[PDB]
Design a protein around this motif. Structure first.
Motif, PDB file in Angstrom:
ATOM      1  N   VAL A   1       0.853  -1.186   0.000  1.00  0.00           N
ATOM      2  CA  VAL A   1       0.000   0.000   0.000  1.00  0.00           C
ATOM      3  C   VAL A   1       0.894   1.243   0.000  1.00  0.00           C
ATOM      4  O   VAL A   1       1.628   1.487   0.956  1.00  0.00           O
TER       5      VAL A   1
ATOM      6  N   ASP B   1       8.134  -0.108   3.719  1.00  0.00           N
ATOM      7  CA  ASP B   1       6.989   0.569   4.329  1.00  0.00           C
ATOM      8  C   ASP B   1       5.610   0.156   3.786  1.00  0.00           C
ATOM      9  O   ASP B   1       4.674  -0.035   4.564  1.00  0.00           O
TER      10      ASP B   1
ATOM     11  N   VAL C   1       2.394  -1.114   6.041  1.00  0.00           N
ATOM     12  CA  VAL C   1       1.062  -0.516   6.034  1.00  0.00           C
ATOM     13  C   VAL C   1       0.010  -1.574   5.701  1.00  0.00           C
ATOM     14  O   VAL C   1      -1.028  -1.660   6.359  1.00  0.00           O
ATOM     15  N   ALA C   2       0.289  -2.379   4.680  1.00  0.00           N
ATOM     16  CA  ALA C   2      -0.628  -3.437   4.247  1.00  0.00           C
ATOM     17  C   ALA C   2      -0.966  -4.457   5.332  1.00  0.00           C
ATOM     18  O   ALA C   2      -2.027  -5.077   5.283  1.00  0.00           O
TER      19      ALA C   2
ATOM     20  N   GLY D   1      -1.121  -3.671   8.558  1.00  0.00           N
ATOM     21  CA  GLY D   1      -1.550  -2.915   9.724  1.00  0.00           C
ATOM     22  C   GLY D   1      -0.491  -2.620  10.775  1.00  0.00           C
ATOM     23  O   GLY D   1      -0.829  -2.280  11.909  1.00  0.00           O
ATOM     24  N   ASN D   2       0.783  -2.749  10.415  1.00  0.00           N
ATOM     25  CA  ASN D   2       1.862  -2.487  11.365  1.00  0.00           C
ATOM     26  C   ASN D   2       2.304  -1.018  11.434  1.00  0.00           C
ATOM     27  O   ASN D   2       1.937  -0.202  10.587  1.00  0.00           O
ATOM     28  N   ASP D   3       3.095  -0.701  12.460  1.00  0.00           N
ATOM     29  CA  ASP D   3       3.591   0.657  12.723  1.00  0.00           C
ATOM     30  C   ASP D   3       4.802   0.990  11.843  1.00  0.00           C
ATOM     31  O   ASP D   3       5.894   0.499  12.093  1.00  0.00           O
ATOM     32  N   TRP D   4       4.622   1.833  10.829  1.00  0.00           N
ATOM     33  CA  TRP D   4       5.740   2.163   9.936  1.00  0.00           C
ATOM     34  C   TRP D   4       6.745   3.173  10.515  1.00  0.00           C
ATOM     35  O   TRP D   4       7.871   3.251  10.036  1.00  0.00           O
TER      36      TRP D   4
END
Ligand SMILES: CC(C)(COP(=O)(O)OP(=O)(O)OC[C@H]1O[C@@H](n2cnc3c(N)ncnc32)[C@H](O)[C@@H]1OP(=O)(O)O)[C@@H](O)C(=O)NCCC(=O)NCCS
Ligand SMILES: C[C@@](O)(CCO)CC(=O)[O-]
Ligand SMILES: C[C@@](O)(CCO)CC(=O)[O-]
Lengths: 375, 376
Positions: A78, A272, A276-277, A279-282
């Motif tokens: 994403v 990154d 995002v895809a 749902g983790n903290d970038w």
């Protein structure tokens, strides 16, 4: 599973989605999450952050041709920038001919910092803590019994001192914790904060900050790739010339921070979007990456590029990679769950390994282009 | 505009949206972009990146109480982590009592690197280039008439050398370009390509890469904030004690890279969401931020915290901030356009200044909590 998606870049989004559902055997409901806008219900969104007034979309794509340790894998991404997904896919294609990407990773170990401050004898206090480390380690673990039954828990402690600061001598204890399939934040902050009282009693000082460290240098993920000169031949240059040009680019990034920053940025263009895809903290991943890049005192390149005894181009990527399969948006976002489904990862470290494979491919793609662009 | 938004916390998303539309006088069409899922058409999405198969949503929120140089401003933020938006809003509220945030910034200058290899004489070649800099600068500008008429264009050139590297001596020229309301990538990469031939002729070497540098240390944005002890007093600690605790936290970040990384991460928790909301490149902003943080040879804190002669807590944030009002998703994404409308920014640097004000507020919020009763 076959991750080679012939003409994938030419099919419509609907046809691509349909394809993907076929290869992976996704259910009807699953496909519906992507075929219709609004997969993230407002009641969930409104519960994720504060002052919510709606949602914001970004394209959701799938990189092709990836192979990790002999197994084909599809990668969700994403992001808003062009040429990322295509570069990743292309480079992955070339990697297949020589075995694909080979990866590995360490245990999921995270640091929990506990800062101490009004100690007249910080250096002596440090040995008092190390003397009673097993006691401290046991207090941190009984804190959370479930984690230990899953194979994680506090494994050890380190203590560092900074006796010369404008606010005085400071003592900093590090709890080393195996967090399993979680990113680690809450798990680690929670133990730091259960041990604070005991540390105060032992040292006689005052505990300040109890918080994780984003410089997760004990949770490393690694990837390797190999490319032959025949695969890099352009109408203008021989494969050998291109490889020499790529080595020049790498050397440039290794000595000049102005190029290293851009060089490393390209790596994060690949990583990154996967974060995002899922749902983790970038922000966590970005901080760990760049801080690690300058651990030696000089801000350099996270990857390395060389030419082996066969004249083959070989690159690597080793870096901190804290991610989770549980926790936060990774569980509540319907599409984050679908991404993991598409990836087929069973552990957080398996996701971490895929991340660096993608970052490495992205770096390679950027340099190949920069090095093959005619004047 | 009054950005305090009373009770925003307990409103429903629909009521919040409605309220925002009132304050700003947004049209029905505009409100509709948020009141309904799918504001990003798939024909647009499919044209943004490759191999698209759908879209992915993240919450779209608005931080309250911000004030920049005496003017109230509403801030859009897109992110997945709790407590970011609330912390930013709360710290902005305390800042209002003492004048809000004060900001400034430099001209939008970006570096365009041109690497040269294949010459045994780098150090002489460098003077040959500097001798003909005006000629080089003119060639780069004739390549973008519009930019210059808009007030931008190549302003100067720098040349650096790395005579000893595993791959031999290297010469690196830097074009310094004012890119105005654009992030700068394509504009600078284009001038670099255009000047490459002339540089080869002058130096006799071979040009390799031609690309911008994400370490945009000539495009800085700055923010300041002030907090009094009375505002930080809790039931457990006095205002003065909290300030002393915050100063301890800052000192900790200044000496230990393990804390600095976490410290700086908190700053980006505030900044990145605003970048995403305006359709800008967040990888570019992250790279410039962290690389800048270790320019002295030690990875430290981007912000600074002190106590002034009155005992008041004062903080600052100066850092590279590359962003644009035009280019890429910033123009094609209907919501990126709506965000700019909500912000009211007229120049890219105005958006950059708001970004650091938010990053500073976020850092403050994290430390106030950590030092006081806990992060948890
Ligand atoms: C969020 C936090 C303020 C909540 O607890 P609190 O201090 O008890 O809350 P208060 O009720 O006193 O907050 C008052 C102000 O904070 C803001 N606030 C608090 N909770 C909020 C929420 N859920 N939504 C929106 N604003 C919120 C409000 O704007 C309010 O001002 P107002 O008069 O305009 O409404 C607190 O936990 C905090 O600051 N935590 C720091 C954590 C951090 O740094 N997080 C970043 C992600 S790590
Ligand atoms: C091209 C590049 O800038 C990616 C764009 O975001 C990366 C690099 O220069 O290596
Ligand atoms: C609370 C903090 O860890 C942010 C979490 O995402 C930042 C900090 O420590 O300053």
């Amino acid at each position: 599973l076959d991750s080679r998606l012939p003409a994938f870049r030419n099919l419509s989004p609907a046809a691509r989605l349909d394809h993907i559902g076929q290869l992976l055997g996704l259910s009807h409901d699953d496909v519906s999450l992507l075929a219709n806008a609004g997969a993230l219900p407002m009641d969930i969104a409104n519960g994720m952050i504060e002052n919510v007034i709606g949602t914001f979309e970004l394209p959701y794509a799938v990189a092709s041709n990836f192979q990790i340790n002999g197994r084909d894998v599809l990668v969700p991404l994403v992001v808003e920038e062009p040429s990322i997904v295509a570069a990743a896919s292309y480079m992955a294609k070339l990697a297949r001919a020589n075995g694909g990407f080979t990866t590995s990773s360490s245990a999921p170990l995270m640091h929990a910092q506990v800062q101490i401050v009004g100690i007249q004898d910080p250096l002596n206090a440090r040995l008092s803590l190390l003397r009673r480390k097993d006691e401290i380690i046991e207090l941190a673990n009984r804190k959370d019994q479930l984690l230990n039954s899953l194979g994680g828990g506090c494994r050890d402690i380190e203590v560092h001192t900074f006796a010369d600061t404008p606010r005085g001598p400071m003592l900093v204890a590090h709890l080393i914790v195996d967090v399993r399939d979680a990113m680690g934040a809450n798990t680690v902050n929670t133990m730091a904060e259960a041990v604070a009282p005991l540390m105060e009693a032992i040292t006689g000082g005052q505990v300040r900050l109890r918080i994780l460290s984003n410089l997760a240098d004990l949770r490393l993920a690694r990837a390797q790739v190999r490319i032959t000169p025949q695969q890099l031949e352009t109408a203008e240059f021989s494969g050998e010339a291109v490889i020499e040009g790529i080595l020049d680019a790498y050397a440039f990034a290794a000595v000049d921070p102005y190029r290293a920053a851009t060089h490393n940025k390209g790596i994060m263009n690949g990583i990154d979007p996967l974060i995002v895809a899922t749902g983790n903290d970038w922000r966590a991943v970005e901080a760990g990456a760049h801080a690690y890049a300058c651990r030696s005192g000089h801000y350099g390149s996270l990857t390395t590029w060389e030419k082996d005894n066969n004249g083959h181009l070989v690159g690597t990527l080793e870096m901190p990679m804290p991610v989770g399969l549980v926790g936060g948006a990774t569980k509540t976002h319907p599409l984050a769950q679908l991404s993991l489904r598409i990836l087929g990862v069973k552990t957080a470290q398996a996701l971490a390994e895929i991340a660096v494979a993608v970052g490495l491919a992205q770096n390679l793609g950027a340099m190949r282009a920069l090095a093959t662009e005619g004047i």
